[PDB]
């Protein structure tokens, strides 16, 4: 939401023309997903025996 903690002074005496305001909008961040891979080639060999 970006609270805009900046306070400062916004004083008014008795009837000062209500200013147009200084509202702050929201800020949106975003991520992305990665892809992993594990390859295997060796067959079931290395069983020259019976």
């Amino acid at each position: 939401d970006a609270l805009a903690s900046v306070d400062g002074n916004n004083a008014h005496v008795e009837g000062s023309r209500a200013e147009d305001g200084e509202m702050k909008p929201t800020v949106i961040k975003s991520n992305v997903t990665q892809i992993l891979r594990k390859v295997v080639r060796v067959s079931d060999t290395a069983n020259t025996t019976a």
Partner: peptide, 9 residues
């Protein structure tokens, strides 16, 4: 015939 495990025997 005979079933062998590994290639070498």
């Amino acid at each position: 015939k005979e079933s062998i495990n590994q290639t070498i025997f």
